[PDB]
């Protein structure tokens, strides 16, 4: 895990770009200004109270390592994605219609791009059956 801790340390230093060893809301907002994602101050404070665990409101190397150390295939995450996908299926039997997914992904959320929505359709399709099942899509989600 030496390469892992080294790469997260250098990423933290790159985001800091100041040498004080901490990530601030101003630095992060400058990062998005450089890359162009139009951040919001509410989103900034929301990620601040989320990632920070020491209660001091700043970002530290041990905190960043601890938050990055979590795994993605947790059974809690599996059940959470199960119940998240359940509400989008009106029938609730695991068979979700094509048109509902299409219009929801288009008009609701952050207005995801049509090409990547079509990518979602083509990879999350059970042999193009239309009434696709999200179980296999979630399984390939959790298989990385």
């Amino acid at each position: 895990t030496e390469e892992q801790i080294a790469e997260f340390k250098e990423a933290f230093s790159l985001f800091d770009k100041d040498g004080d060893g901490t990530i601030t809301t101003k630095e992060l907002g400058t990062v998005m200004r450089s890359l162009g994602q139009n951040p919001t101050e509410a989103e900034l404070q929301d990620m601040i109270n989320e990632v920070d665990a020491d209660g001091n409101g700043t970002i530290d190397f041990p905190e960043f390592l601890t938050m990055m150390a979590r795994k993605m295939k947790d059974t809690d995450s599996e059940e959470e994605i199960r119940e998240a996908f359940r509400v989008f299926d009106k029938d609730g039997n695991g068979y979700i219609s094509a048109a509902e997914l299409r219009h929801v992904m288009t008009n609701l959320g952050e207005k995801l791009t049509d090409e990547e929505v079509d990518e979602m359709i083509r990879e999350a399709d059970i042999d193009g059956d239309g009434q696709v099942n999200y179980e296999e899509f979630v399984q390939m989600m959790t298989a990385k």
């Binding site: 790469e7 990423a11 990620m47 090409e115 990547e116």
Partner: protein, 356 residues
């Protein structure tokens, strides 16, 4: 197509009023089968009912087999129960296991005289009515006996502590009363204290407020110690019932506090979109990398930004499933106040630039 879904809702997941009426009729026929099974146990109608009810019992078991067959056939609508593998997965469900056990117990032996096992076999059909509530069987974390039995699970540690204290008090008090009244024999020439099993039995009787009427010392010391034991230990014994009732009323109050069901759709959609953003972070050749726009060496930066966006979406979704609360009010006030402060600061600096 839709007929499979309709019959699946008719069988397992009730809706409307016709399916509710059908489930009501199922409950009443379960009551009828249990009641004639229990009345068949009487000695006066042991033979007449057995001879007469042969046709009714065989047609009932045939109906149960046919309903199980149609339920498993209609299970194909559910994505978890598709194909032979899906049928096997449906078989592993506890409700299906119980139903299969009941059917095989019914058909263990054919063309044989009835015995006490026939009543036991029909007694297993009593729990079938409860399977309607547990027909969902989505998971095992909390379902029916566990979903509303979570009240016990929420209070499990301290309930165990209370029952442990009660058991210790019971056994200790039995030991004291035995040692004190080894020589105490009440009226009718019966030795009340002859076995520590009897002592523990009377301890259970006293803690349960039973009062059989056979084993009570007439000594004043015994009366006083029994009174102290009653005024000390009965409250702890009766604690769990009020504990669970109060916790259930707590969650009932929480029910009206619950947030609206339709407000979680944007949060779930954002969570799914961020999950895919994390997935496509693994693929530098994905077309999503061109949405921001060149940029070549910031692939890791984009990946970690999408990962932290997914973390934020996870936190937002976890806050959404929580009902409206003091924490929600506090965070809403905090975000509003910080927005106000930012706006005031920008207005102040703008005015300073304007007039400075």
């Amino acid at each position: 197509t839709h007929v499979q879904g309709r019959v699946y809702n008719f069988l397992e997941r009730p809706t409307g009023w016709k399916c509710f009426v059908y489930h009501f009729a199922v409950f009443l026929i379960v009551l009828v089968c249990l009641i004639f099974s229990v009345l068949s146990t009487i000695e006066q109608y042991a033979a007449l009912a057995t001879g007469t009810l042969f046709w009714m019992e065989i047609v009932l078991v045939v109906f149960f087999g046919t309903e199980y067959v149609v339920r498993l056939w209609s299970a194909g609508c559910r994505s978890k129960y598709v194909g032979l593998w899906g049928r096997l997965r449906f078989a592993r469900k506890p409700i299906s296991i119980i139903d299969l056990i009941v059917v095989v117990a019914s058909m263990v032996v054919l063309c044989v005289g009835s015995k006490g096992q026939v009543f036991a076999t029909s007694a297993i059909r009593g729990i079938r009515f409860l399977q309607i509530l547990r027909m969902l069987h989505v998971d095992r974390q909390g379902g029916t006996w566990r979903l509303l039995g979570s009240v016990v699970f929420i209070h499990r540690q301290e309930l165990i502590t209370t029952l442990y204290i009660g058991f210790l008090g019971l056994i200790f008090s039995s030991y004291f009363v035995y040692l004190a009244e080894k020589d105490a024999v009440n009226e009718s020439g019966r030795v009340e204290f002859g076995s520590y099993a009897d002592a523990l039995w009377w301890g259970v009787v006293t803690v349960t407020t039973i009062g059989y009427g056979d084993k009570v010392p007439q000594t004043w010391v015994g009366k006083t110690i029994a009174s102290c034991f009653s005024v000390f230990a009965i409250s702890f014994f009766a604690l769990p019932a009020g504990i669970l009732g109060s916790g259930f009323a707590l969650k009932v109050q929480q029910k009206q506090r619950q947030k609206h069901f339709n407000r979680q759709i944007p949060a779930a959609a954002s969570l799914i979109q961020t999950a895919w953003r994390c997935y496509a972070a693994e693929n530098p050749d994905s077309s999503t990398w061109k949405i921001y726009i060149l940029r070549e060496h910031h692939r890791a930066t984009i990946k970690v930004i999408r990962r932290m966006q997914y973390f934020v979406a996870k936190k937002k979704f976890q806050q959404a499933r929580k009902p409206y609360d003091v924490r929600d009010v506090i965070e809403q006030y905090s975000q509003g106040h910080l927005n106000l402060m930012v706006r005031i600061k920008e207005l102040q600096r703008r005015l300073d630039q304007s007039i400075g």
